[PDB]
Amino acid sequence: CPAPPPGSPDIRAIGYYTDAARSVIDPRLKTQNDAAVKPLNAFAAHVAKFADAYAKGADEAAGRCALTWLDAWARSGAMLGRMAHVNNDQSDYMRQWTHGAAAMAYLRTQALASEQQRTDIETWLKRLSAANLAYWDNPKHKRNNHYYWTGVGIMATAVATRDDTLLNTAQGIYRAGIDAIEPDGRLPMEMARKRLALHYHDYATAPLVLMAEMARLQGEDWYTYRQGALERLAARVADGYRDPSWFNTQSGAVQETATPKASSGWVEFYRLRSPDPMRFDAMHAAGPFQDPRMGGNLTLMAQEGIVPL
Secondary structure (H helix, E strand, C coil): CCCCCCCCCCEECCCCECCCCCCCECHHHHHHHHHHCHHHHHHHHHHHHHHHHHHCCCCHHHHHHHHHHHHHHHHCCCCCCCEECCCCCHHHHHHHHHHHHHHHHHHHHHHHCCHHHHHHHHHHHHHHHHHHHHHCCCCCCCCCHHHHHHHHHHHHHHHHHCCHHHHHHHHHHHHHHHHHCCCCCCCHHHHCCHHHHHHHHHHHHHHHHHHHHHHHCCCCCHHHCCCCHHHHHHHHHHHHHHCCHHHHHHHCCCCCCCCCCHHHHHHHHHCCCCCCHHHHHHHHHCCCCEEHHHCEEHHHHHHHCCCCC
């Protein structure tokens, strides 16, 4: 168990896209963004590592290691300060993604927390939840995938705290995504990303499924809501990787060749829930998948459960 990095209240992230469709990256700005947010990404990467090692069994130390990192940032009031904007709201997005990754690690290692630790972390996770959720009160922020990733931290905090109010708002974020699916299967805000249209349909499917799976922790079958819709979106994503023909036309760009990776590991869960599961064998074969912002190892979590008992 290493030592936790500093939990600054303040974030200064850097947007790195150059075109309106937010699909062409500036390399100079991505390297600058990577360095600016190295401690946020490092915090998520370790605290998920500690959870994966915990879920391997016979390693209560790793679980208690993450709870030390999470408790340290809790008392630092980390990420609750200034979200510095330079050329966009990339800092806000990092708070959304880092909160999620944090809330997942606490959801997964919760059982080993002391009472000083449960109080510190949960109070922090709810005080983050309020912050990230207040961001989306401004109607000028389109509620695209970014909105649905905010639900990862809200949902995990809700289930971890057993807060029925946070459960509903979290359900509202998921349902808002499911409602955004169009009859042809498209999410029009993800479809407007051109050469990354498939990629962002994939990236949009990840928090929706993961939210639905944590709802299973409380016996709720969220795939019931607007049943069949998420299948349509999930199907196009699986179709797009074999043949990007549809995505090419509906986006007006030639999709960017790419193998499924990391966040696209939502398919490890959804294939257990779909009516037509063998359709996702090709994506499943690209595994295993691991993503700190969704809790860690999605392939194992789909087999052993999000929360190891």
